[PDB]
């Protein structure tokens, strides 16, 4: 996250996984990402697209978080990082990253964890709110529309 | 794609989104009518007419419907004002400014810019321009100048198609014009919407030995008795005694607040003077007035507070009694303007910028004399002039009538030219499109583009021109730029051929970077002060001196040989004094108290302030010109010139935010 | 002039300024190219036998897309850096602000695309700007490119010519040339199609042999190191019309022998 | 006043309120009080922490720090506080009067003194170079000339907030100068002549490097002596 946009990786596209293989279990113990081992070091560029558990990825700028009152958006009280989020295709921008947007009613977040992934998950309450039932604490996300 | 001209209001608007505690005029229900159908207005009505309530309103209507308004006027003085004025006037409306040296609330939904920000604005691409739904343009009639004329046409062809046009001004002969034009480039229907007169009517009268000799009344119908009467009982300029016998004539009428129009920046200072044992304030005016000046000028630095004109101003504003020139720092004239609208000033010499813009009206009006100097000898007030600063005297409520006095010393004035002055068809100005060699050389390297094809639509003195850029090494005989003339395309201020020869000279090289900022000053200062220079510099800037001299000089020559006719400020350079400045800037840069240089400067602390933001630019150029030529010792002598010759107090904070 | 050489003391006058291509101490003035000596008034300074293309504002340039950015295009044109095209620096067809054009560049303007432009103003460190808000500018079609060093193109005051054969070609200061069939604009110089990828339908076997025949020629005065003139240019045409076929102008004999006509009918 | 260690026993009564500082966690999962860091526990409406040795900087709010200019964008510097770390952000209107006209003249290689003001989990660090808490401008700004001086963390905030350390009070008694300390382990000093600065250094680095607080006239008697 930053003040001016959020960086997301594309996990599915349209309920199909993305990739078929997401390389765990390649590095050995602990929790390590998929780039952190040893193999990173030694991948032949000049011989193949990618890496094991590569993915694609995306850009949400602040002005297409919404579709009104695009410019007093703050990002933290929209998203966090670690969080699930559905959103749309907006271009295909260069080779790094696509546009994404979330300015509909059905899209936005889905999955959240309290204390910024350290807790357990919360459950949707209203269209801009969060809830912990174990503890009734509330945050502020920008909640996609359930049912 | 029209433009139209026009000529059960309860039941149409029975929810309007503004109210106010008074009768609407029937243009003022006629713009809010078509403001509610979704069509774009034009309003050409009289001066103090009420031409603000139309804006209020816009804006009310985008609040209401969660869109945003964008205001903008030609002159930057204009914009704080209105700032403050929006400000006060509507509390659940965020209000915004952006200028070029301020930007307040960029998000707000209420913004107030210049016609130059909103053209980079545009150009940029922003995006809050698809929320914005009206677009105000206030003081339409000053926007045909040159260079205010073709940014103010740009902004009006760039503005996309969902915008809507709101325009303000005063009765011009070229109206419908500019309404048609708007109309048919962006394809909108645009209703024009006049008013018959002043809601206020104004009279002329004339004064002569005690007495106030009624000449013109209410219907604008001359009376030639009374003149006869005027010319018959006087039989120069003002005396010690004259101020005196007015303040005092109009203080028992009941008429007290009074501008007076004196055409000279000393000669107000002396007419103040010249009132003395004169109050307004009993007890506790005088008290709140010191309270408000000593609170507002907290801002600047403490040994910035001592300085002379602060302390006369401060003298003078205890008794109601100010004065309103250019030779003013910033922030004392926009101390002055903040309690004139207060009501706590009553007797007030202005100069000629104080009609211009500036909405702050009063009761009376007094000119000094018909005539003033503009550059090249006297002349005799034009109508259009004497039209503006007249009226601003009947404000709209508190007054039934705008009264006009106009003096006459010890002789009587002549009939036709007080005719030809009060009474005639004001025309449009125009400029003779003056052409100087920074243009001719930026035409010169553009592809293509047959210059003489394009003068047409000023030719002899082209081909004369030509011929010095081909004397002095500008050119070659192709008319192909070289390295001199590409530094000369750099230089836009005023002098490009002579700076150009000064710099390629080896000139500036062996003086510091304090002493360089100290000779520049001559392209900055125009010397119109009849005061001795200083007589001991040192022992350098005395050949500095010389050295430009003679290379102007030589440039006169080569200007004469060719037979060009010269301008009134390049003809009379040297006759000028325009080195007296130099002591000023030297020990500026040096670093020295501000207070200690007054004590020797032959100029107010405004105009001293002025010549150090002109330098600025002239650093600018030079630097650019050393990278063209690739000198870098020039260059850091230049950045460090920028850095000697900026203070706190040149950057103080407006008032009025 | 005097050649000079790196390291080289060029003059121990304390009365000149120095410019490009020295260096000094104290009193002493240095030479650090290969070029020759020039004096202007107090100025001086050493211009170099070689180098790339150093654009210059007012040029009219010949350049191929490189990448496509963040509200700007980047454009080759031969020099040492690319230049900088702004998205506010172009006409938009439909229009700027409209409730796109931003994510959506690649419809009008996309990698590998040749396009006609003007130099608009130099960054600080020599960089060029540029724009295309005329129509005399913008993508190129209907034709074929060709390239010569940029030092052969004489300065002239117009770069576009109406050749014999309706062909008409495009030079440019930086050395990138394009020729193309005479359209419209062309004759009457003496909306949303101006981003178009199609040429026109109806190009003859005559105009693709013109073309060639014009192409050839070029390079043979390339070849020879005669800079290039629309007089020039069509006499060259002209004078090779000895040979039936296109294809025997690729001989360096021929070549040189087009070259040696020309410069002798010229000192002539 | 004890001494304690991570996963030890937390001696506070569960029933009464205190805010919590650092060395000390609050599980998300149990909502359990427990300590995470070695050192002395230190308990004051009451307050509680942990003092413990450190050299790694966390930025955190209202702290007076010391950095580095290592870049400029179009509207704000790119600063960093310590080698190999994370870099913080300054931002052009973060000096006192400025405005789009009056522009800051700082360049790359400069040394800042600043305040941390806003310190959140998610995004990077601000600093700025005035107090907006309180309007004042107590030495913020740009530093010239001058020697840097790395120390830990703990020095750091013995010479910033305890009067009674005595290490300024001896200097001050050998020559003048000006000093500035940064929580994030820098000091910058100067003085007149370079050769004071130079034993204003040796005796500042010698007694860090030592733990007694007794020795430093000494020190600073014998590198004051070295000199000449
Ligand atoms: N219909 C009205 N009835 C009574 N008072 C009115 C009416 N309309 C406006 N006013 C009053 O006029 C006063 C000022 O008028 P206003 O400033 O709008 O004149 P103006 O035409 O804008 O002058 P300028 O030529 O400088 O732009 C306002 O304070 C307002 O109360």
């Given at each position: 996250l930053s003040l001016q946009r959020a960086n997301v990786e594309i996990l599915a596209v349209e309920d199909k996984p993305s990739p078929i293989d997401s390389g765990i279990g390649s590095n050995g113990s602990g929790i390590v990402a998929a780039g952190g081992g040893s193999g990173a070091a030694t991948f032949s560029v000049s011989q193949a697209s990618s890496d094991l558990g590569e993915t694609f990825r995306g850009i949400i700028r602040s002005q297409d978080v919404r579709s009104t009152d695009r410019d007093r958006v703050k990002v933290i009280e929209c998203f966090k990082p670690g969080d699930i989020v559905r959103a749309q295709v907006l271009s295909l921008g260069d080779g790094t990253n696509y546009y994404l947007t979330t300015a509909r009613n059905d899209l936005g977040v889905v999955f959240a964890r309290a204390a910024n992934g350290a807790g357990g998950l919360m459950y949707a309450t209203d269209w801009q709110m969060m809830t912990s039932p174990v503890t009734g604490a509330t945050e502020k996300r920008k909640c996609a529309k359930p049912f | 794609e029209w433009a139209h001209v026009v000529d059960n209001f309860d039941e149409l608007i029975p929810n309007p989104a503004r109210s106010w505690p008074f009768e609407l005029d029937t243009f003022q229900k006629e713009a809010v009518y078509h403001l509610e159908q979704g069509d774009s207005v034009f309003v050409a009505a009289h001066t103090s007419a009420g031409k603000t309530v139309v804006a209020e309103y816009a804006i009310a209507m985008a609040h209401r419907n969660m869109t945003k308004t964008i205001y903008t006027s030609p002159i930057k003085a204009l914009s704080n004002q209105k700032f403050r004025d929006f400000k006060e006037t509507f509390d659940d409306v965020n209000i915004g400014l952006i200028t070029g040296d301020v930007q307040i609330n960029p998000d707000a939904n209420c913004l107030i810019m210049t016609t130059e920000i909103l053209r980079s604005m545009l150009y940029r691409g922003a995006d809050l321009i698809r929320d914005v739904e009206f677009v105000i343009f206030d003081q339409v009639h000053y926007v045909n100048d040159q260079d205010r004329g073709v940014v103010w046409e740009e902004v009006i062809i760039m503005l996309p198609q969902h915008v809507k046009f709101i325009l303000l001004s005063a009765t011009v002969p070229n109206t419908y014009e500019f309404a048609n034009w708007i109309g048919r480039t962006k394809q909108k229907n645009i209703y024009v919407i006049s008013t018959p007169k002043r809601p206020v009517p104004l009279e002329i009268n004339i004064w002569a030995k005690k007495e106030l000799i009624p000449v013109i009344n209410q219907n604008s119908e001359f009376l030639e008795a009374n003149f006869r009467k005027h010319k018959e009982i006087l039989n120069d300029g003002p005396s010690k005694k004259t101020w005196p016998e007015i303040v005092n004539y109009l203080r028992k009428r009941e008429l007290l607040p009074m501008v007076v129009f004196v055409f000279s920046k000393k000669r107000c200072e002396e007419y103040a003077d010249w009132l003395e044992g004169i109050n307004f304030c009993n007890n506790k005016e005088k008290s709140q007035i010191h309270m408000?000046?000593?609170?507002?000028?907290?801002?600047?630095?403490?040994?910035?507070?001592?300085?002379?004109?602060?302390?006369?101003?401060?003298?003078?504003?205890?008794?109601?009694?100010?004065?309103?020139?250019?030779?003013?720092?910033?922030?004392?004239?926009?101390?002055?303007?903040?309690?004139?609208?207060?009501?706590?000033?009553?007797?007030?010499?202005?100069?000629?910028?104080?009609?211009?813009?500036?909405?702050?009206?009063?009761?009376?009006?007094?000119?000094?004399?018909?005539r003033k100097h503009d550059g090249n000898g006297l002349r005799e007030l034009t109508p259009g002039e004497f039209?503006?600063?007249?009226?601003?005297?009947?404000?709209?409520?508190?007054?039934?009538?705008?009264?006009?006095?106009?003096?006459?010393?010890?002789?009587?004035?002549?009939?036709?030219?007080?005719?030809?002055?009060?009474?005639?068809?004001?025309?449009?100005?125009?400029?003779?499109?003056?052409?100087?060699?920074?243009?001719?050389?930026?035409?010169?390297?553009?592809?293509?583009?047959?210059?003489?094809?394009?003068?047409?639509?000023?030719?002899?003195?082209?081909?004369?021109?030509?011929?010095?850029?081909?004397?002095?090494?500008?050119?070659?005989?192709?008319?192909?730029?070289?390295?001199?003339?590409?530094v000369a395309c750099e230089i836009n201020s005023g002098y490009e051929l002579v700076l150009t020869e000064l710099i390629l000279d080896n000139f500036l090289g062996s003086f510091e970077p304090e002493e360089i900022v100290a000779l520049l000053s001559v392209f900055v200062y125009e010397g119109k002060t009849r005061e001795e220079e200083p007589p001991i510099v040192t022992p350098r800037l005395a050949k500095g001196k010389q050295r430009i001299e003679e290379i102007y000089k030589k440039m006169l020559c080569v200007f004469n040989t060719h037979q060009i006719p010269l301008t009134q400020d390049e003809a009379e350079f040297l006759d000028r004094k325009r080195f007296a400045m130099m002591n000023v800037v030297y020990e500026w840069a040096r670093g020295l108290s501000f207070k200690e240089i007054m004590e020797m400067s032959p100029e107010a602390e405004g105009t001293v302030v002025r010549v150090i933001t002109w330098l600025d630019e002239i650093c600018r150029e030079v630097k650019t010109a050393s990278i063209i030529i690739g000198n870098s010792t020039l260059h850091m002598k230049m950045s460090r010139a920028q850095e000697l010759i900026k203070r706190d107090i040149v950057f103080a904070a407006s008032l009025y935010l | 002039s005097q050649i000079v050489t790196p390291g080289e003391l060029v003059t121990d006058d304390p009365i000149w300024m120095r410019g490009h291509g020295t260096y000094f101490l104290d009193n002493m003035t240095y030479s650090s190219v290969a070029g020759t000596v020039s004096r202007v008034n107090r100025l001086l300074s050493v211009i170099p036998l070689k180098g790339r293309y150093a654009p210059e504002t007012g040029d009219h340039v010949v350049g191929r897309i490189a990448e496509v950015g963040n509200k700007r295009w980047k454009v080759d044109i031969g020099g040492k850096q690319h230049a900088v095209l702004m998205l506010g620096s172009v006409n938009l067809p439909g229009g700027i602000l409209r409730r796109s054009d931003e994510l959506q560049m690649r419809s009008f303007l996309k990698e590998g695309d040749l396009l006609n432009?003007?130099?608009?103003?130099?960054?600080?460190?020599?960089?060029?700007?540029?724009?295309?808000?005329?129509?005399?500018?913008?993508?190129?079609?209907?034709?074929?490119?060709?390239?010569?060093?940029?030092?052969?193109?004489?300065?002239?005051?117009?770069?576009?010519?109406?050749?014999?054969?309706?062909?008409?070609?495009?030079?440019?200061?930086?050395?990138?040339?394009?020729?193309?069939?005479?359209?419209?604009?062309?004759?009457?110089?003496?909306?949303?199609?101006?981003?178009?990828?199609?040429?026109?339908?109806?190009?003859?076997?005559?105009?693709?042999?013109?073309?060639?025949?014009?192409?050839?020629?070029?390079?043979?005065?390339?070849?020879?190191?005669?800079?290039?003139?629309?007089?020039?240019?069509?006499?060259?045409?002209?004078?090779?019309?000895?040979?039936?076929?296109?294809?025997?102008?690729?001989?360096?004999?021929?070549?040189?022998?087009?070259?040696?006509?020309?410069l002798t009918a010229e000192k002539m | 006043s004890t001494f304690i260690f991570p996963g030890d026993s937390f001696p506070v009564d569960?029933?009464?309120?205190?805010?919590?500082?650092?060395?000390?966690?609050?599980?998300?999962?149990?909502?359990?009080?427990?300590?995470?860091?070695?050192?002395?526990?230190?308990?004051?409406?009451?307050?509680?922490?942990?003092?413990?040795?450190?050299?790694?900087?966390?930025?955190?709010?209202?702290?007076?720090?010391?950095?580095?200019?290592?870049?400029?964008?179009?509207?704000?510097?790119?600063?960093?506080?310590?080698?190999?770390?994370?870099?913080?952000?300054?931002?052009?209107?973060?000096?006192?009067?400025?405005?789009?006209?009056?522009?800051?003249?700082?360049?790359?290689?400069?040394?800042?003194?600043?305040?941390?003001?806003?310190?959140?989990?998610?995004?990077?660090?601000?600093?700025?170079?005035?107090?907006?808490?309180?309007?004042?401008?107590?030495?913020?700004?740009?530093?010239?000339?001058?020697?840097?001086?790395?120390?830990?963390?703990?020095?750091?905030?013995?010479?910033?907030?305890?009067?009674?350390?005595?290490?300024?009070?001896?200097?001050?008694?050998?020559?003048?100068?000006?000093?500035?300390?940064?929580?994030?382990?820098?000091?910058?000093?100067?003085?007149?002549?370079?050769?004071?600065?130079?034993?204003?250094?040796?005796?500042?680095?010698?007694?860090?490097?030592?733990?007694?607080?007794?020795?430093?006239?000494?020190?600073?008697?014998?590198?004051?002596?070295?000199?000449?």
């Open positions: - | 408000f000046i000593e609170k507002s000028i907290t801002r600047l630095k403490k040994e910035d507070r001592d300085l002379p004109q602060i302390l006369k101003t401060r003298s003078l504003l205890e008794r109601g009694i100010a004065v309103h020139h250019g030779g003013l720092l910033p922030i004392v004239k926009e101390l002055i303007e903040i309690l004139f609208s207060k009501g706590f000033i009553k007797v007030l010499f202005a100069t000629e910028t104080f009609a211009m813009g500036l909405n702050l009206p009063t009761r009376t009006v007094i000119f000094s004399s018909i039209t503006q600063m007249a009226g601003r005297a009947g404000r709209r409520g508190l007054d039934s009538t705008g009264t006009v006095i106009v003096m006459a010393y010890n002789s009587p004035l002549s009939i036709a030219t007080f005719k030809e002055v009060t009474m005639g068809v004001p025309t449009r100005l125009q400029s003779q499109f003056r052409l100087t060699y920074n243009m001719i050389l930026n035409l010169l390297r553009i592809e293509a583009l047959r210059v003489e094809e394009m003068i047409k639509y000023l030719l002899p003195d082209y081909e004369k021109r030509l011929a010095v850029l081909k004397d002095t090494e500008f050119i070659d005989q192709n008319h192909n730029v070289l390295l001199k003339g590409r | 432009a003007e130099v608009q103003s130099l960054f600080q460190d020599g960089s060029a700007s540029l724009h295309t808000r005329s129509l005399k500018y913008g993508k190129l079609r209907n034709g074929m490119f060709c390239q010569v060093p940029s030092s052969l193109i004489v300065r002239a005051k117009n770069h576009t010519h109406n050749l014999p054969g309706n062909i008409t070609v495009v030079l440019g200061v930086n050395g990138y040339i394009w020729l193309r069939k005479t359209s419209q604009m062309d004759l009457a110089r003496d909306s949303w199609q101006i981003y178009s990828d199609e040429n026109d339908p109806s190009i003859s076997n005559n105009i693709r042999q013109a073309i060639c025949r014009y192409a050839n020629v070029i390079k043979a005065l390339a070849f020879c190191e005669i800079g290039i003139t629309q007089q020039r240019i069509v006499s060259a045409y002209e004078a090779s019309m000895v040979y039936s076929n296109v294809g025997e102008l690729i001989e360096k004999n021929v070549m040189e022998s087009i070259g040696s006509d020309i | 569960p029933t009464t309120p205190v805010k919590l500082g650092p060395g000390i966690y609050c599980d998300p999962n149990t909502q359990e009080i427990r300590p995470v860091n070695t050192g002395v526990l230190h308990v004051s409406v009451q307050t509680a922490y942990i003092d413990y040795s450190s050299k790694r900087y966390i930025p955190s709010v209202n702290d007076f720090v010391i950095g580095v200019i290592i870049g400029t964008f179009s509207d704000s510097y790119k600063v960093s506080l310590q080698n190999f770390s994370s870099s913080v952000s300054l931002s052009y209107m973060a000096f006192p009067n400025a405005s789009k006209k009056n522009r800051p003249t700082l360049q790359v290689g400069d040394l800042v003194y600043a305040r941390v003001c806003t310190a959140e989990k998610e995004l990077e660090a601000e600093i700025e170079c005035f107090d907006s808490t309180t309007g004042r401008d107590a030495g913020f700004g740009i530093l010239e000339d001058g020697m840097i001086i790395d120390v830990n963390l703990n020095f750091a905030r013995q010479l910033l907030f305890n009067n009674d350390f005595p290490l300024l009070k001896v200097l001050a008694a050998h020559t003048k100068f000006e000093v500035a300390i940064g929580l994030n382990g820098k000091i910058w000093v100067k003085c007149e002549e370079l050769s004071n600065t130079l034993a204003c250094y040796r005796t500042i680095m010698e007694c860090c490097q030592k733990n007694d607080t007794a020795a430093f006239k000494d020190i600073a008697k014998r590198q004051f002596k070295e000199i000449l």
